[PDB]
Amino acid sequence: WVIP
Amino acid sequence: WVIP
Amino acid sequence: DSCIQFTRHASDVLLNLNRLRSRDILTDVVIVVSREQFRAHKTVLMACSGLFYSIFTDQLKCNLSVINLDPEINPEGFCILLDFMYTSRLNLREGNIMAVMATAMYLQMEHVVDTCRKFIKASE
Amino acid sequence: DSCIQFTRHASDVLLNLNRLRSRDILTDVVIVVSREQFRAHKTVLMACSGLFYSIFTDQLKCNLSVINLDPEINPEGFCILLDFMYTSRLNLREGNIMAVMATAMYLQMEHVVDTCRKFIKASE
């Protein structure tokens, strides 16, 4: 999961 | 396009 | 094999599937979550959720155009997860995380259940 | 928004859609390319091809379960492109590049037409  |  | 691969293809496909959903094009099922209704594509639901995969591979249920979820399921939680299925983006907030995690456990969306557990653990 | 994003989601969705195709689950159209038949999901075809997008948004054609392509289309070229739609991988070879490019122009798959043009230019 990432900060888009 | 890339070499997978 | 000796194939070449277009990096953005899968993301572009998903973006186009979400544009079809927006525009109500070729949607083939309504998911009912108490008083709310959500239109979607069975194949996208099956690709994202272990529960929908089991439902639409059933020889009788595969033909239904309406699926009613358990009354304990929160419509907002379902909406957030449906948006995630079609976009890869999860609108996880302090005010919705418990409903989102409960819905993802029910729908059998293991990666979502994983990030919810991690975000909850960090606040404890 | 303040969303989080699961990097592998779109690729995992496409992998699952290809597993449904393999297993002939919820396929809803047969594409006929002379003597050959290919089963697929209309939504995946529309998401990848400008031609299928135009076909399945037509109020009459959206309801067809069989689509016959132009007799000039090469079945192997179509097969290679159908595999690309469901996997992001293109089996481009000296022996098939002309048929693949002609098929991608017909199907309106601009990124494929682009890589074929580049590979052809490099050999000249």
Ligand SMILES: O=C1Cc2cc(Nc3nc(Cl)ncc3F)ccc2N1
């Ligand atoms: O957490 C999750 C997400 C999820 C999706 C699926 N989907 C499919 N699985 C397979 Cl093997 N082939 C085709 C599919 F559409 C099954 C189980 C699970 N569990």
Ligand SMILES: O=C1Cc2cc(Nc3nc(Cl)ncc3F)ccc2N1
């Ligand atoms: O080279 C290409 C690939 C391609 C795909 C599509 N697909 C869709 N386009 C839109 Cl805007 N919304 C939903 C769709 F399924 C249309 C045109 C083109 N041309």
Ligand SMILES: [Cl-]
């Ligand atoms: Cl997930």
Ligand SMILES: [Cl-]
């Ligand atoms: Cl393309």
